């Protein structure tokens, strides 16, 4: 929300980095079932998605304006696992993704990319 | 194509074609295994059971991936050979495939 | 039909129960009725039923059972493998065994459940049955380590006199043994 | 690199299997044949050669 305001009306571009959201997800949780609400898939409380698009959401260009919010978070999904609901649901949500992937990183080559499945 | 056995036998081998080599002069074969390849002309090698045609990995070391002539069994000459023959066959097929 | 050795119900009865008789379709498409399937099967039982085996059958009597199971057990493995060129690449003995085989599936197994003359029988119809059926083995390992023609032993008029073994109605069983017996003993005195 | 995961797989997995275990079900009964066809040249071989070296 620091981001909206060097953004909009004061120009400039900006590339924010929330490094790590893994452990977002896992301290909402918590308060999720701590509660009541209902599981809805691998016990992360259901209504994720909509808490993961406030968050990814604003950003963007906006109209005949100036500025710029690009937004590089870095996920942290367990073990090269590609359904474990958190990286999951951030699919859809952000517009495709680049991963690094044990899978080159043992040959040396750095920094690993690879591109099979990464879209953007 | 080429062959060797005893020079005492190989004579006739000498008469029509077979071009041959002696067989007395190594008891390795692999100095006439090499020239022989020099031509290569000759697609056909074969050997006394004088030596053995159990070792060929001389071939192998020298053709590698090249394949050219398989050394044949001759024997150096019928004084009986069909005790063994019946024998060659079966010696054949137990280790290679499946024994029996 | 969730068709396993292994969902719960099954390896359940199977720890508490005491033997298992498999049944399975695939030697009974083959026709051999009934096909308890023998190789699969179990029964834990036999140990303590020694006592009473030995006192009523014969006394050799265990000394039997154990004897003949090791046919199809050293059958088995060699058809397994082996079989792959068919009874004509193998040696002497090893022919030998899958002919006692043949046998051991031709009578001592399949019977039938419509004959008034078989479909029951008792301990000491069986035992003379497995008798003759090892009796004329051993000696006909006899006759192939002299290297004698082998595929004429397959041939003997002997084999018919067992070939028709289940068919002897217990009545005359005793004296089937009788004539049919010692006449082994002779069928290889001719060679 | 990756344990395979935890869904959807089951189905897909398991044909890997329908098709494996059919295909080398059957890959022997396609090598039966050539067992066949190694006895062809078996028999065949030194017949006359052993015989016209003797004269």
Redesign the interface.
Known sequence: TVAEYLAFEHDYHVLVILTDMTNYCEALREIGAAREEIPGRRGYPGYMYTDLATIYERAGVVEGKKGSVTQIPILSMPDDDRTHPIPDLTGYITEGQIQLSRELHRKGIYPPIDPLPSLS | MAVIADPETAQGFRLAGLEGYGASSAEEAQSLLETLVERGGYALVAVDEALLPDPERAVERLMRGRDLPVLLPIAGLKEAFQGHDVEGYMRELVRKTIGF | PGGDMSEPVTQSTLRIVGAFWRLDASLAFRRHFPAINWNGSYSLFTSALDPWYRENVAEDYPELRDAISELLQREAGLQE??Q??GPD???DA?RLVIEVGRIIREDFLQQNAYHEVDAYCSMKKAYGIMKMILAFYKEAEAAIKRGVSIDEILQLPVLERIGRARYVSEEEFPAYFEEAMKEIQGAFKAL | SQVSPTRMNLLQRRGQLRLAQKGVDLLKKKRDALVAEFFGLVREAMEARKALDQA
């Open positions: 493998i082996v792959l060129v690449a193998l040696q090893e």
